[PDB]
C-alpha cells in the first residue's frame, strides 16, 4: 500500500480475510519479515509463479496483490519462518523497488457494494445455495464442517465471495484472476461457474462409474 | 488384479468415448448407408458386408478391411 | 468441459498402457498436424487417416504403414 | 449550477415541440417558429389501453437483467 517489504507466496493464493499461516523459507524474504514487523505487521503480500523465480523481483510477480493483518509472529527456527497472517483487500500494483527486500505500493480495496443490492443478495444467496449444494456434492474430499459454520457470520459479500474460493480448491491461476477483479458480482458469478463446471465433472464421474457397475455385472 | 481393473474402466471408458461411445457415430453410418443413393443390389450387398461386420470385435484383425471397404462405399 | 475431462482420462490411458509410452504419442501428432501446415485438404485428409489409424490394435500391418504416412505428412 | 470540471450541467424538460420559420445566422443562433404544435389526448379509452399495452411492455421490458441490473425504481 505504502511500499511494505514484499514476501512471497510460495504456494496457493490467500483471498481476502482468510485467516492463513504463510511459510518463509528463503532468507531474501526473511528479513522481509522482519522488517515487515518493521512495517507495522501489514504486508503489501505481491504472490509469484510457482517453481519461482528466487531472486526477488517485480518480475517473480502477480499483479494484484493481497492486504493483510499479521495475528501472531511465531519464532520457529526450522528454516522457514512461519507467520499466520489474516488477509484486508486485494490490490492494483504501483510501483517496484525490487529486492531483497522489495518495495511496492498498492491502491484499493475490496469493500465493493455494487448498486441493486437486491441483485447483491440474491446472487450472494445463489452462491450461496451453490456452496451449500456443492459441499454436499464434494465429501468425496471431505470438506470442513467449520466451513459453513463460520460462513454463516458473514456481512461483506466482497470477502464472502474470497472467503468461498478460498474453501475451494482451485488452480493458482483462477485464485489470481479473482483476485484481479475488483468486483463483487463478477467474483460471485466466477465462484459459481467454476462450482457448476466441477458439478458437471462429478457427473461425468457418476456416469462412468455406472459404466463399470454395467461392465462388472454383464461379465 | 489391477491389471483386470485397468481393462474395467477402459472399456467403461471407451464406452464413455465422445459423449459416449462412437456407437453414435455408428449408427450415424447406419444411416448414411441408405442416404446418399444407392442402386439396389449395392445397398443390399452394403447391408450384408454389415451384417458381417457387426458379428466381429472391437480390435480387430479384420473388421478394419470390412469398415474401411464401408467408408469407401458411403 | 465434457470433451476436455474426456481427453484428460484418455491420455492418462495412452500413458498408463505401460506408464508411459502407450500411445501416448498421437495427440502429439495431432499437435504436430495443427502446427506445421496445413492447406485444408491434407488436413482433412490427414485427420482421416489419424482417425482410420486409432481404433485398432498397434501390433497389425496396416497400422504400420498408417503410421509411416501420417510421419511423412508431417 | 457548474460542475467542479468545467462542464455546465443544464436541467431541461421540453413542454412544446416547434417549427422554425428561418434562421438567423451564427454565432451565436437565433431563430423564430412558426407554432407551438399541440394536440390534446380525446377519447382516452382506448388511448389508455394502449397506455397500459406499452406499460405491460416496459415492465416485461425491466424484468430483462438479471446479472445487468436495470433499474427497478
Known sequence: ?219 | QREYYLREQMKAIQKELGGEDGLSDLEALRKKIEEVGMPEAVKTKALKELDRLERMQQGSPEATVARTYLDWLT
Do not use: C
Not at chain 1, 6 to 18: A, Q, S
Not at chain 1, 77 to 92: H, I, K, N, S
Not at chain 1, 149 to 157: C, I, L, Q, W
Open chain 1, 1 to 219: 500500500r505504502l511500499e511494505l517489504p514484499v514476501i512471497p507466496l510460495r504456494n496457493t493464493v490467500i483471498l481476502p480475510h482468510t485467516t492463513t499461516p504463510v511459510d518463509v523459507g528463503r532468507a531474501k524474504s526473511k528479513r522481509a519479515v522482519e522488517e515487515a514487523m518493521g512495517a507495522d505487521r501489514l504486508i503489501f503480500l505481491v504472490a509469484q509463479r510457482d517453481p519461482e523465480v528466487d531472486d526477488p523481483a517485480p518480475d517473480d510477480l502477480y499483479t494484484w496483490g493481497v492486504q493483510a493483518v499479521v495475528k501472531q509472529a511465531m519464532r520457529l527456527p526450522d528454516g522457514t519462518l512461519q507467520v499466520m497472517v489474516e488477509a484486508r483487500a486485494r490490490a492494483q500494483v504501483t510501483d517496484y523497488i525490487p529486492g531483497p527486500y522489495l518495495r511496492a505500493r498498492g491502491e484499493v480495496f475490496s469493500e465493493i457494494f455494487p448498486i441493486d443490492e437486491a441483485v447483491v443478495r440474491v446472487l450472494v444467496e445463489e452462491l450461496k445455495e451453490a456452496f451449500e449444494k456443492y459441499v454436499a456434492n464434494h465429501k468425496s474430499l471431505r470438506l470442513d464442517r467449520y466451513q459453513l459454520e463460520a460462513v454463516k457470520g458473514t456481512s461483506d459479500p466482497a470477502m464472502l465471495a474470497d472467503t468461498i474460493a478460498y474453501h475451494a480448491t482451485w488452480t493458482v491461476a483462477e485464485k489470481q484472476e479473482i483476485l484481479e477483479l475488483t468486483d463483487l458480482e463478477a467474483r460471485l458469478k466466477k465462484v459459481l461457474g467454476l462450482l457448476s463446471r466441477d458439478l458437471e465433472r462429478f457427473e461425468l464421474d457418476k456416469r462412468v462409474a455406472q459404466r463399470v457397475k454395467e461392465q462388472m455385472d454383464t461379465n
